[PDB]
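User: quick one - fold this with nicotinamide-adenine-dinucleotide bound?
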Amino acid sequence: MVCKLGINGFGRIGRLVFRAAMERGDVEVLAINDPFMSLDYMVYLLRYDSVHGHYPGEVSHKDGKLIVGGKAVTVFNEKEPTAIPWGQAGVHYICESTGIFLTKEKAQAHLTNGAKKVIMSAPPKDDTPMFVMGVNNDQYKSSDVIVSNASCTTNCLAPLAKIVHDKFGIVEGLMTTVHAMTANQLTVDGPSKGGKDWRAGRSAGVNIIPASTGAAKAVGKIIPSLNGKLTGMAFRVPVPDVSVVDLTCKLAKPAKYEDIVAAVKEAATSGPMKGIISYTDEEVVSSDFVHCKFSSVFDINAGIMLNDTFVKLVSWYDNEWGYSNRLVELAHYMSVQDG
Amino acid sequence: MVCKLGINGFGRIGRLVFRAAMERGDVEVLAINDPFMSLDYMVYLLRYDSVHGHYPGEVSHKDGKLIVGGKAVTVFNEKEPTAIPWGQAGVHYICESTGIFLTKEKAQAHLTNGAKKVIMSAPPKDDTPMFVMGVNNDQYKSSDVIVSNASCTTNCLAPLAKIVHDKFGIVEGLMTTVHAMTANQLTVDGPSKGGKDWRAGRSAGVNIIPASTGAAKAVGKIIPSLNGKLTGMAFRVPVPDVSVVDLTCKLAKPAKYEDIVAAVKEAATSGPMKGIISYTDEEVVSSDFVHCKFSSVFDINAGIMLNDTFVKLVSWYDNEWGYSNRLVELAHYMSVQDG
Ligand SMILES: NC(=O)c1ccc[n+]([C@@H]2O[C@H](COP(=O)([O-])OP(=O)(O)OC[C@H]3O[C@@H](n4cnc5c(N)ncnc54)[C@H](O)[C@@H]3O)[C@@H](O)[C@H]2O)c1
Ligand SMILES: NC(=O)c1ccc[n+]([C@@H]2O[C@H](COP(=O)([O-])OP(=O)(O)OC[C@H]3O[C@@H](n4cnc5c(N)ncnc54)[C@H](O)[C@@H]3O)[C@@H](O)[C@H]2O)c1
Ligand code: NA
Ligand code: NA
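Assistant: Sure. Structure tokens for the protein plus nicotinamide-adenine-dinucleotide:
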């Protein structure tokens, strides 16, 4: 209809969600909030991107508002969610892309002056429900006031896992994501914030860096029958964007590799994963997915079967752009369902 | 009692095999052949290294010979192996590290004028026997005139595979190696030599690049009971050296993770894999293994078990330095057994 969107935290995800939203005819961005940047600064970070190129349209400001392609967007600079007048901007759905309000109690604070619902741009730290478009978004209810769009990796893996589990049955699986660098990593060796994850504090540009991830386990929440049947981990490597899922799983039913390819192709061509999952049989590398909108691109030639029940599947994802498009689509999906 | 070594192809492996041979009194490098570098250029490439630091010692040349650590080394610049006078230079064992002579018929060209044996610094294209020190080098026979030291990845995987297979049994496994950049890759997008590996010719510094590899299947040759039970693939990523094995396997006997750790520690501490396999429980990243001599360093904290028979195990390797040490160790072992 028109999804009336607001964005909290104008970072990689906030700015790309903004761009995706601007591209859609059925979503409008009515407000932005980020206290670590002025208007001139926002204009700059929106104009230029080291990965996704120049903003496709003129960006400026006037009378305290951001002006993008003729449209005015209201701007706030509040540290604390409760102090953001979203209702006065007419915002309904909030993209919560700061990375630090990942509980219901915290995200709730956005909803006391007129806004309707919050979509977390990360997996929740509590039992907030996660949705992955094309996999379980039909489970959303209009009483789900706070929701999460999961992670980039979960959006890559869940669609592939659904197809394989539905057609052949996954007995058990272990996942690795070889993942692009992110904002929480450091340029040179130093202390990670909170002292959480020491490996993340080591020079990003010159290291392969192991990392924990709940993303495969999270597929167990998206696809309940796989709870306890999937987990995994990550290696962070020196590229600025684009990642790849490497899923090793045992199948319940024997398959030729061509049967798995056909099932993916079928899911990509029509039904709920059209525009979500895709495939390639070409000799692709990660830069080939810069600014690719899909959640998951199955790499036909990269995968390998040991035998007819034990297989290693490969699927690409632009962790930044794919995820940001899914989040906007989830916001729009909720807006339609809510009436 | 000295292994008289020659080096064909003075590359990453050639020059590091040279360093390793210089750190032991029971191996001498008597001659080097590389037709793509003058004597002056050889001195330069040996002096300086982007990953392993300056050569530790004076390098010069005099009367047509490379002069290192007081010793004189004979230098040739021949493209055709049959033109290299190994015999006259006093060479017995040849480190064949050019990348292009990986069949018996081709490697035999080194043995026409007085040399005894050739060691391929890569897996062969034919049925040439492969050996991994600490795993199956005792299968070596003095009649094996042409042999291979396998690959860096096989040297990292085989020791780990042996330990897990002997202690718990490997029903099946699939391996990924996240691998440092190599000389066969290109700096910017272009055509790979022979038009073979298209992905490998894509800009190395800005891509995660899938690659095929027989390194896991080769473990089935090193450890015959695992023939047909292991394979895998690789992703080449933008680091200059150091790689890591990610092995997903199904065990025959149930195990707690601590049992796998204990098994690896025992093998690292005494017996045939002392000096071959090691372990860490620290928050390491790839650069911590630059100039690490081990074939395989088990990363205790990076591993993850889904359940008591399905596990993902992680092991680091300095693909240049670990491998180069193993090759020299293999050449020496051969010289001793040959008498
Ligand atoms: N590939 C990806 O980059 C990716 C994919 C999926 C999910 N995510 C998740 O999305 C979230 C944001 O990630 P990102 O990559 O955009 O990080 P980022 O560092 O680029 O964005 C963070 C932004 O939030 C702003 N911010 C900080 N405190 C704020 C506050 N109190 N109020 C309002 N704004 C505030 C910062 O100024 C910054 O602009 C994280 O939870 C991350 O894990 C990232
Ligand atoms: N991580 C590694 O670099 C690594 C690890 C294990 C095995 N290997 C294998 O070892 C071999 C060498 O690898 P590298 O990384 O040292 O490659 P490299 O390109 O650094 O070295 C190859 C050298 O051989 C020389 N050469 C080319 N043609 C020759 C000829 N006709 N006669 C003599 N020399 C010639 C080149 O000038 C070059 O110096 C390859 O088979 C490779 O797969 C490499
Ligand atoms: Na729009
Ligand atoms: Na020596």
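One thing worth noting: The radius of gyration of chain B is 20 Å.
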